[PDB]
Write a protein that binds this ligand. Structure first.
Ligand SMILES: [Mg+2]
Ligand SMILES: [Zn+2]
Ligand SMILES: [Zn+2]
Ligand SMILES: [Zn+2]
Lengths: 97, 178, 171, 107, 270, 554, 88, 112
RNA sequence: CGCCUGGUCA
RNA sequence: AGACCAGGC
């Protein structure tokens, strides 16, 4: 079935934080990618076996993370990149406020 | 899950300037003379010269075996065996590194008294010298200001040869026996 | 050269262990994962000091599973050699391409051609060795090397050093 | 303050912001015939000392930009002669609770 | 649109209505920090009624044979008559109830006295009644010092904001203001003893409740009022099945758009 | 989720840095040249040529390989490749700015056209807001068409001060198709019109000042004007434009996989004309083609008509179309999705269910599941539901042990066997009193969605209590409704504690209750009331019995 | 900044009573954990449902949790289930 | 005085149906429209242009168009917007998620 | 509006 | 997987 826009807005109203997330992630997309702690990209070449991770270009192997996002968004991002735009994924805030 | 370090360097993309590591007293950014304490304060780098290290380890490795029993209710070749024990009791045992750091540390050490190592430090800290030298001087036997200023090229112009030679003398004087 | 650096690690604890002696379990896992580790940014982590006052702070509970995550701030004794650093250790292995000295938790190797010429290599020796006019280096022989370059690797650090300068050789 | 009748020449007005600190304001007759502030709908405003303002912020933990704004040309804003950065406190009645205290910074 | 335009607005832990930037949109949710679900149309008695009647109800004059509380009401009735020190609190009470009158006649010019307000008092008393089987016969046992001094004391505890300072604490008095009028409106001495013959017990309970019942009506820092507000309007806009102006639905579309050329421009001048 | 453990630490995205790709970076990242335009067939031989899709990049055929990166299809995101263009091309969307920027700087030297010197300029240089500066700065110097080398400073209009030099007249500019042209005025007369080669534009921007970038809403690290023009082109991996195999000896490539095929072709042809018989201005009759395809690939719904239809008259989804509002990625994939653990049927009223309940048909109750963790508090109950199988009602249909492996109860040669292990999870059936979220679209209330107590029943309908009718705004004339089943012990919580129907009784959208009594119950409650109406013992006793909370005091 | 972002147990200003969202989430979180096989701090009076047990731990305020309340500017205030008044 | 009118008028639209809405809602909206400075419309033209994050305004009417000038001006999104998280698959700071929960190891001992 | 079932198109 | 048409409240 479909948990569309309107349905979301209600859950948001109810302030049903977690459940809303659950509907979106665990109950649908939910994908696990790797990022470069340097350039906010999916570049990373995680071999999740011999624990190698690398990221030639920004050249890494040490500063790497793992995040859960909707495969719809992995796609949204790659799609934006293919249009030469860079959606950086950073795991820590720096601009304060 | 590795282990970060007290300092959020805003790595804004361009990660290209990884300087070299030489006795130009240029150690990784991770070891500037100016690092930060947990409390948030600044603090001089911390350089341990052999033996002085052997004590810092042994001392914590000991006060560990102790707090490991508070909750348990609910001479050269001689110290080799004595420490092996302190290991198979408060170590991971599979830390083949510490075994080796303790034999090495306990073999090439240059002092046996927390008194001696204390005087050694009192003395050397009056030079205003950098901690990495202040360490190298304590763990490396030196007879000439040349043997010194040569194996520790970061010195060279930071102290007259006579000066550094006096200090060197006092070192062989304090240098515990066997 | 040996250092005492202030570090901090993050551990994710399963609700299972959310008992009474948790602080206890945390610390223990800290050690299992840190003591004996190895980076290029910290080199060899060897011993966690002040076991007693290790700071756990308050850990927070993740939000899908109950696992909580604490940022365990500690302090310990580290050691990462450098290029141009002078250290002396015992020789362990020794072949036709050189001998390999061991300084602490690390092994520094010296090329047959990074020594002096008047020092050749003797094959039919037991144990294998390197002879000279008045010097003879083999197994237990205590050397003093100058670390020329360092190559960080896996959970270890190797480096090549020379003994072709002055005040560098045996003792 | 200067009160023009039908208007001022575009050659005249470009001479006001030429003698700081002192400032000048232009007002039209037909515009001041009635006092807007006296309108059923217009609640009363109030200026705030660069202290009272530096307090309003500190008390609400607000950065200047998160504050409700009022037009530099806003009818009332002129009436009191605000200045880019000045803050006004608007106090009006309320069908939920007697009165409501609200602030307006000027852009 | 309404929704997408308010998603991010929620009441923060300081009791402020802000969005994702942190910009204040309302300093106190709804100009009263009350959660809509805890509100009923109460009536502010103090507003209506002739100037005459008013006095006949809230006026107590311990210094008069015909304007004093007949001891058939108060236990300490007769031994109160003439006491000047009381008559000051008593007059203080009255001067207040009158300031209220004028104030309300300023906010609500219509004369309309029925408004949405937290803590239904008319009922909070009705229970007080039969919960202590209070008999309209025998006299009370409240000191006049009891009533007026606990009533003023109650207000001190109807907390919306907590702030440890002047700016904040002053907003408090604002957020409450209206409520209190209603509060004093129903806890006026005369009223308290003649209209609803409470006792010491009765009163203390009625008080105890109002306080807690109030504290419940406050809005929970967490409320996603942006979407709430949006939906609450948009919804009844779908239920719209349809003197000569611009009507509703097309009119609202007009409004939200902030359109220059509206079908009906009109303008009423008095 | 995403399966298989990783020594990688995991955090949550706290910020999003939007930038532009530096042709260099594009190269750094890429894991494949992409020289050929074809798909595979190593000369009919199936596989993939080191040309397009998988010159090392992602894969197909269910074969680990992904540059050793193994994993295969599910786990391995895509691995961007690149493609060195023949000549710089614009960026279908940036054209707006690329142009609006040139009108802001002067060619030849490349620098602002209004310095601190011009006063009306200072004001535009204080407005801390890239969107607004650049929108002011541009309205200022979009008019002045002469690169002034000397201007009247903060003193006498008599004394002329100097700065940058080369007054080279500035040409007004206009947009025609995907190319920018401008006319230069000469006095003495008549204009001078020429096409502004990308190769040139690109350059002037390259030279534009570091502090000039910034003054004009830009960014030294992330988005430098010189990047709005494509030198190198990122090639999205298979997963973005997956194939589709009708078994074997059949293709199935995606729309995009073709436009690259196009762009690539159109590129090679160019290059081959520039290291060969290059009829100078007969090349720019094909360089525009690359400008075309590489514009189309990203946007295909432009103003200069040419829709670039795919042989068949079919439009061709531009990447942009894939995201465009509603039904598209952002609005129809991320802001809303399809979900598992959800059912729908026809609703009917049942005057015998407490308000908060919801009659669920056994059919569904046996379909919908709930991951319960084997705990000493239910180890028993659970082993029973497991023995009960996926067919009898109170039962379950899947057991999962810590070793991330699914046991399919309905087939497994061990269904009857199996002793659960604490910590394992048993996906069991929805049972009586499993808090669920119910709802009737269109959803415009908090209330169009509420939490009910599952009450499994026969027959195929969602039997809901009556009074909870108007909050959903439903009738029974063939009305359908949706049921969503929570999943984590905390999820339920959020439903039972804030979404329960009892909680929604008083609606804040009008500070008054939102559910009442309708039809029969209402109509009847009036009649029953009336003074005129009296009831005798034999029945009065029955009526008593029915109120479940009768204290037994006739 | 940190610790500069944490308001002292004194000077505390948020609400004394637990928000509905908090309690809702504490019960959920605690439930999830109890179901996770975590230690239960109350006598299970026979109870066997986590959220049932959670409701109990929460009624004898024996829930080892702390609610960190963020303010619009980043600073926060820490409260414990133990403290917080549970009216609702 | 304008907010006053804007409100007054909006109320008249809902009142003309014989319906009832609690001040607050219409007020909040009337306010959202006013604060900023003048009369900010609830349209792709007004409100959806404010400083709000990109990804947020991204989910409404100008999607790609907005995303483009978003990397062209190297914007930064706080991830404070509800939408933001919804798109990332994270728990948005909303009711249940407007705070954090921690195991106070201290009290976790006094309990036994 | 949104949601669902068609199938139909080949 | 999509574009059209039929239907449903
Ligand atoms: Mg119907
Ligand atoms: Zn990288
Ligand atoms: Zn791969
Ligand atoms: Zn020029």
């Amino acid at each position: 079935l479909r948990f569309g826009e309107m349905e979301r807005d209600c859950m948001i109203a109810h302030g049903a934080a977690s459940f809303l997330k659950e509907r979106l992630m665990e109950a649908s997309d939910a994908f696990r990618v790797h990022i470069c702690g340097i350039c906010g990209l999916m570049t990373v070449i995680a071999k999740l076996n011999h624990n190698q991770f690398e990221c030639k270009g920004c050249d890494n192997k040490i500063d790497i993370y793992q995040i859960h996002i909707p495969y719809a968004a992995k796609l949204l991002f790659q799609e934006l990149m293919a249009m030469n735009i860079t959606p950086r994924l950073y795991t820590d805030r720096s601009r304060d406020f | 899950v590795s282990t970060s370090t007290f300092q959020t360097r805003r790595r804004r993309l361009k990660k290209v300037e990884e300087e070299e590591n030489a006795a130009t007293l240029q150690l990784g950014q991770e070891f500037q003379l100016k690092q930060i304490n947990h409390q948030g304060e600044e603090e001089e780098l911390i350089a341990l010269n052999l033996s002085e290290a052997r004590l810092v380890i042994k001392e914590a490795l000991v006060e560990r075996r102790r707090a490991f029993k508070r909750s348990q209710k609910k001479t050269r070749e001689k110290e080799l065996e004595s420490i092996d024990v302190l290991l198979e009791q408060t170590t991971g045992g599979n830390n083949k590194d510490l075994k080796n750091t303790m034999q090495y540390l306990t073999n090439f050490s240059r002092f046996r008294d927390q008194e001696t190592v204390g005087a050694v430090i009192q003395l050397l800290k009056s030079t205003g010298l950098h901690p990495f030298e202040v360490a190298q001087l304590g763990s490396l036997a030196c007879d000439t200001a040349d043997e010194a200023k040569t194996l520790i090229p970061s010195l060279n112009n930071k102290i007259s040869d006579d000066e550094l030679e006096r200090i060197l003398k006092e070192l062989s004087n304090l240098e515990t026996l066997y | 050269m040996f250092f005492i650096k202030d570090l901090s690690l993050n551990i994710t604890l399963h609700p299972s262990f959310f008992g009474p002696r948790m602080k206890q379990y945390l610390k223990t896992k800290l050690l299992e994962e840190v003591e004996g580790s190895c980076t290029g940014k910290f080199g060899y982590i060897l011993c966690v000091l002040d076991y007693d006052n290790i700071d756990i702070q308050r850990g927070r509970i993740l939000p899908t599973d109950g696992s909580a995550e604490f940022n365990v701030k500690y302090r310990a004794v580290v050691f990462k050699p450098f290029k141009g650093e002078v250290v002396d250790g015992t020789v362990v292995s020794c072949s036709q391409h050189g001998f390999e000295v061991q300084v602490g938790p690390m092994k520094v190797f010296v090329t047959k051609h990074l020594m002096p010429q008047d020092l050749t290599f003797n094959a039919g020796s037991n144990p294998p060795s390197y002879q000279s006019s008045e010097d003879v280096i083999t197994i237990k022989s205590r050397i003093r090397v100058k670390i020329e370059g360092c190559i960080s690797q896996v959970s270890s650090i190797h480096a090549i050093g020379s003994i072709k300068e002055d005040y560098l050789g045996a003792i | 303050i200067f009160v023009y009748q039908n208007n001022i020449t575009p050659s005249a007005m470009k001479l006001v912001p030429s003698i700081p600190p002192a400032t000048i304001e232009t007002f039209n007759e037909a515009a001041l015939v009635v006092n807007i502030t006296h309108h059923e709908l217009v609640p009363k405003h109030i200026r705030l000392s660069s202290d009272e303002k530096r307090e309003l912020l500190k008390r609400y933990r607000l950065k200047e930009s998160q504050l409700p704004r009022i037009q530099r040309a806003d009818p009332v804003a002129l009436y009191l002669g605000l200045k880019r950065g000045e803050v006004v406190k608007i106090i009006r009645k309320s069908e939920t609770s007697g009165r409501y205290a609200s602030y307006r910074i000027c852009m | 649109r309404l929704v997408k335009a308010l998603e991010d607005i929620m009441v923060h832990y300081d009791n402020t209505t802000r969005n994702s930037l942190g910009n204040v949109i309302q300093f106190i949710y709804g100009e009263d920090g009350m959660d809509a679900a805890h509100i009923e149309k109460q009536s502010l008695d103090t507003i209506g009624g002739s100037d005459a009647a008013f006095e006949k109800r809230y006026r107590v004059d311990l210094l008069n044979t015909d304007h004093t509380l007949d001891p058939s009401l108060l236990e300490s009735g007769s031994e109160i008559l003439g006491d000047l020190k009381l008559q000051v609190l008593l007059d203080e009470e009255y001067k207040q109830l009158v300031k209220d009158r004028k104030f309300l006649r300023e906010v609500f010019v219509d004369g309309e006295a029925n408004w949405p307000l937290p803590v239904n008092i008319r009922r909070i008393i009705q229970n007080a009644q039969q919960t202590f089987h209070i008999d309209h016969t025998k006299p009370s046992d409240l000191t006049i010092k009891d009533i007026v001094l606990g009533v003023k004391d109650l207000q001190e505890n109807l907390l919306v904001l907590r702030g440890k300072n002047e700016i904040i604490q002053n907003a408090q008095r604002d957020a409450v203001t209206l409520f209190c009028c209603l509060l004093r409106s129903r806890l006026a001495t005369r009223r308290v003893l003649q209209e609803y013959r409470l006792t010491k017990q009765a009163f203390d309970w009625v008080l105890s409740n109002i306080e807690a019942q109030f504290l419940r009506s406050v809005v929970h820092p967490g409320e996603m009022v942006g979407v709430l507000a949006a939906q609450s309007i948009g919804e009844p806009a779908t239920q719209m099945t349809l003197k000569k102006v611009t009507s509703g639905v097309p009119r609202l579309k007009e409004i939200l758009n902030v359109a220059k050329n509206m079908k009906t421009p009109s303008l009423t001048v008095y | 989720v995403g399966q298989q453990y990783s020594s990688a630490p995991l955090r949550t995205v706290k910020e999003v840095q939007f930038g532009l790709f530096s042709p260099e970076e594009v190269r750094a990242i890429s894991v494949a040249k992409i020289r050929f335009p074809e798909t595979m067939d190593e000369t009919q031989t199936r596989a993939k040529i080191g040309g397009l899709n998988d010159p090392r990049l992602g894969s197909i055929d269910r074969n680990l390989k992904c540059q050793t990166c193994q994993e295969g299809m599910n786990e391995c995101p895509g691995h961007f490749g690149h493609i060195d263009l023949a000549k710089p091309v614009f960026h279908v969307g940036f054209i707006a700015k690329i142009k609006k920027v040139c009108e802001c700087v002067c060619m030849h030297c490349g620098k602002l056209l209004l310095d601190e010197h011009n006063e009306l300029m200072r004001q535009a240089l204080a407005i801390k807001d890239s969107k607004k500066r650049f929108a002011a700065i541009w309205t200022l110097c979009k008019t002045k068409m002469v690169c002034e080398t000397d201007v009247p400073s903060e003193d006498d209009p008599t004394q002329l001060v100097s700065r940058g030099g080369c007054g080279n007249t500035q040409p007004t500019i206009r947009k025609d198709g995907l190319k920018l042209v401008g006319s230069w005025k000469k006095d003495r007369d008549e204009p001078e019109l020429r096409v502004l080669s990308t190769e040139e534009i690109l350059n002037i921007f390259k030279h534009i000042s570091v502090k000039d970038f910034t003054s004009l809403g830009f960014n030294e690290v992330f988005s430098r004007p010189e990047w709005m023009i494509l030198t190198c082109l990122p090639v999205p991996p298979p997963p973005v434009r997956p194939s589709i195999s009708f078994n074997e000896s059949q293709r199935g490539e995606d729309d995009l996989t073709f436009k690259l095929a196009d762009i690539l072709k159109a590129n090679i042809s160019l290059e081959t004309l520039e290291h060969n018989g290059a009829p100078h201005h007969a090349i720019e009759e094909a360089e525009s083609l690359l400008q075309f395809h590489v514009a189309t690939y990203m946007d295909n719904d432009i103003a200069g008509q040419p829709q670039a239809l795919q042989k068949s008259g079919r439009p061709v989804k531009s990447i942009r179309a894939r995201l465009k509002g509603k039904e598209g990625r952002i609005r129809g994939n991320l802001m809303g999705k399809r979900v598992d653990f959800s059912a729908r049927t026809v609703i009917s009223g049942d005057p015998n269910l407490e308000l908060d309940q919801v009659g669920v048909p056994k059919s569904i109750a046996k379909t919908l599941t709930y991951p319960e963790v084997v705990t000493p508090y239910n180890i028993d109950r659970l082993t029973q539901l497991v023995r009960n199988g996926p067919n009898e009602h109170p039962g379950a249909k899947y057991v999962i042990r810590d070793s991330g492996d699914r046991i399919d109860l309905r087939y497994s040669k061990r269904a009857g066997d199996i002793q659960l292990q604490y910590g394992w999870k048993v996906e069991r059936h929805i049972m009586d009193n499993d808090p669920v979220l119910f709802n009737r679209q269109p959803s415009l209330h908090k209330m169009s969605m509420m939490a009910h107590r599952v009450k499994v029943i026969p027959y195929s309908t969602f039997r809901l209590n009556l009074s909870v009718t108007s909050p959903y705004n439903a009738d029974f004339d063939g009305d359908e409704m949706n049921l969503h089943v929570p999943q984590s012990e905390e999820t339920r919580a959020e439903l039972s504690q804030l979404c329960a129907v009892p909680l929604q009784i008083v609606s804040p959208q009008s500070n008054k209750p939102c559910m009442g009594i309708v039809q029969d119950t209402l109509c009847g409650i009036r009649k029953l009331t009336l003074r005129d109406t009296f009831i005798e013992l034999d029945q009065v006793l029955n009526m008593l019995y029915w109120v479940p909370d009768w204290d037994g005091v006739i | 900044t940190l610790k500069e972002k944490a308001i002292p147990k004194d000077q505390r200003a948020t609400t004394p009573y637990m928000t509905k969202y908090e309690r809702a989430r504490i019960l959920g979180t605690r439930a999830l954990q109890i179901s996770m096989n975590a230690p239960v701090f109350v006598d299970l009076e026979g109870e066997t449902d986590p959220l049932r047990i959670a409701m109990k731990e929460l009624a004898e305020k024996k829930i080892p949790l702390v609610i960190r309340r963020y303010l619009p500017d980043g600073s926060f205030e820490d409260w414990s289930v133990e403290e917080l008044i549970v009216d609702l | 005085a304008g907010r006053a009118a804007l409100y007054k008028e909006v109320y008249n639209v809902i009142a003309s149906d014989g319906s009832y809405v609690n001040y607050r809602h219409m007020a909040l909206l009337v306010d959202v429209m006013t604060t900023q400075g003048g009369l900010t419309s609830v349209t792709r033209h007004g409100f959806n242009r404010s400083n709000t994050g990109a990804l947020m305004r991204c989910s409404f009417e100008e999607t790609v168009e907005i995303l483009f000038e978003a990397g062209a001006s190297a914007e930064l999104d706080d991830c404070r917007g509800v939408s933001e998280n919804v798109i990332l698959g994270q728990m948005a700071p909303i009711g249940t998620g407007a705070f954090d929960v921690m195991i106070d190891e201290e009290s976790l001992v006094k309990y036994m």
